[PDB]
């Protein structure tokens, strides 16, 4: 027996509405947690600079993610990418808010980043995991996607389009490959290994 020596995180509320609640389309994860971004933004109860978008994803894009709602079961979705929220509560713990996954919404970082992510040290090198980082209000000022990605050569949809027009910016209608690329010289944010992203979030 032993004391964890504070309680903080005990009575965290959450940042977004109930999972069922939240805006919402499968395999448009990005626009998903780009919606949770405008909700917070535009609530009362937790600023945004407390706020990240994270994409995970590697350079052949097939990441491995357990607990995922798409494959129930103790095996992993190989996604070319995902983007999830991570929320830094004053309190110093993390959470991340996955619409995705079978675990919690939110859950403790620790939680995720051990039961979803899992290590990578026995995971053939190539298909190990990398984490971008980009603060919500960036995120919100800078993200665009025109969702030419989601149609296949004829103009068909891969997976029905979320019901509200193409987020777009002043600056661009369409970059999101730099979101999913993993390569620093590109996009915002930062990017980090598995090992990086626990050592700055993690407890
Ligand atoms: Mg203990």
């Avoid at 805006?23 to 990240?52: A, G, M, R, T």
């Avoid at 808010?97 to 675990?103: E, I, K, M, Q, S």
Wanted: overall charge negative; charged content about 25%.
């Amino acid at each position: 027996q032993g004391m964890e020596g504070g309680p903080a995180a005990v009575h965290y509320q959450p940042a977004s509405p109930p999972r069922d609640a939240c805006v919402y389309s499968s395999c448009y994860s990005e626009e998903n947690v780009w919606k949770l971004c405008e909700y917070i933004k535009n609530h009362d109860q937790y600023p945004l600079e407390e706020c990240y978008a994270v994409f995970i994803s590697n350079e052949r894009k097939m990441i491995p993610i357990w607990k995922q709602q798409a494959r129930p079961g103790d095996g992993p979705v190989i996604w070319d990418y995902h983007v999830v929220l991570l929320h830094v509560s004053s309190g110093g713990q993390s959470f991340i808010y996955d619409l995705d996954t079978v675990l919690p919404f939110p859950c403790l970082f620790d939680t995720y980043v051990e039961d979803a992510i899992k290590s990578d040290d026995d995971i053939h090198p190539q298909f190990r995991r990398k984490f971008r980082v980009i603060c919500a209000d960036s995120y919100l000022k800078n993200f665009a996607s025109d969702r030419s990605h989601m149609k296949d050569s004829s103009g068909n949809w891969r997976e029905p389009p979320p019901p509200y027009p193409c987020i777009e910016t002043g600056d661009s209608k369409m970059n999101l490959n730099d979101f999913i690329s993993m390569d620093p010289k590109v996009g915002w944010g930062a990017v980090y290994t598995l090992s990086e992203f626990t050592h700055r979030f993690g407890s």
